[PDB]
Paper text:
Sar1 recruits heterodimers of Sec23 and Sec24 to the membrane, thereby forming the inner layer of the COPII coat. Sec23/24 is an adaptor complex: Sec24 binds transport cargo while Sec23 interacts with Sar1 and recruits Sec13/31.
We incubated giant unilamellar vesicles (GUVs) with yeast COPII proteins (Sec12, Sar1, Sec23/24, Sec13/31) in the presence of a non-hydrolysable GTP analogue GMP-PNP. To understand the architecture of the Sec13/31 outer coat we applied reference free, contrast-transfer function (CTF) corrected, subtomogram averaging to solve the 3D structure of the vertex, and of the connecting rods to resolutions of ∼40 Å (and ‘Materials and methods’). In contrast, there is a 45° bend in the rods of in vitro-assembled protein cages.
Numbering used by the authors: 2 to 157, 169 to 292
């Protein structure tokens, strides 16, 4: 179902609506594109523009609040646009960070219309969209050099999300009505280089599963069982993948690992009966 040459500039992200019927591509050309996919067809609708620097990542909001797609660019700003009347418009612009923003994912509709922003400005922001338009932002420093990922943890307070460091550190953050904002929990060390990406699973089974990919060219699957329980570092393999590792994605169900390399190859992984990993 290829959509050959969607952009002019190299593409940095390919995400779909909750109903895999409409896509969203973003590139360096500072532009994002909306799509329609059927059997093998690709209808190109609008092309989102207002981004000064290369767009990095984008994320589809839950249909619960209509059609909304958020994008983050080098321009140190993340922007969201809705699709009222089949015509794409820019609803709000979030630019609190001072430097590139490399990741932006939406919170489980349960939580609400929340967006988690992680900038290379070393900080991270949490923003929910009220009514009138003016939101109440929440920012908290998260890493030394910077921040590269900010995946969320499923619903359960009890609001958690993992961060990937520019300083090689993976962290866990849980809300706190007494602290007024998300505070640190874990600080799982493991990578020798920078944490390129970290995604948290929705697999509600007995134990929690977290993925961490990095310039150190390895994935460390962080498995923990309960509050007490510490996270068990686990090398996806006791060798190095020839190139870096940029993305890690969790399948809806069946909990399978989508590990987008850098050697330009995508690999899939599963945890056999023991607790190790194998292809698919």
């Amino acid at each position: 179902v290829v959509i050959a040459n969607a952009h002019n500039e190299m593409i940095h992200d390919a995400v779909m609506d909750y109903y895999g019927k409409r896509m969203a591509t973003c590139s360096s050309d500072k532009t994002i594109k909306i799509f329609e996919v059927e059997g093998e067809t690709h209808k190109l609708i609008d092309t989102l523009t207002g981004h000064e620097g290369p767009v990095w990542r984008v994320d589809w909001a839950h249909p619960k609040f209509g059609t909304i797609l958020a994008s983050c660019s080098y321009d140190g700003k993340v922007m969201i646009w809705k699709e009222e009347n089949g015509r794409w418009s820019q609803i709000a612009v979030h630019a609190v960070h001072s430097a590139s923003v490399n990741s932006v994912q939406w919170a489980p509709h349960e939580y609400g219309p929340m967006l988690l922003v992680a900038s290379s400005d070393g900080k991270v922001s949490v923003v929910e969209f009220k009514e009138n338009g003016t939101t109440s932002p929440i920012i908290i420093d998260a890493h030394a050099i910077g921040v590269n990922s900010a995946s969320w943890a499923p619903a359960t307070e009890s609001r958690k999300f993992v961060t990937g460091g520019a300083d090689n550190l993976v962290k866990i953050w849980k809300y706190n009505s007494d602290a007024q904002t998300y505070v640190l929990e874990s600080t799982l060390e493991g990578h020798s280089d920078w944490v390129r990406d970290v995604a948290w699973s929705p697999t509600v089974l007995l134990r929690s599963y977290m993925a961490s990919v990095s310039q150190d060219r390895t994935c460390i699957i962080w498995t923990q069982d309960n509050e007490q329980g510490p996270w068990k570092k686990t090398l996806l393999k006791e060798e190095k993948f020839p190139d870096v590792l940029w993305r890690a994605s969790w399948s809806l169900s069946g909990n399978v690992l989508a590990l987008s390399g850098g050697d330009n190859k995508v690999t899939l992984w599963k945890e056999n009966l023991e607790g190790k990993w194998e292809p698919a």
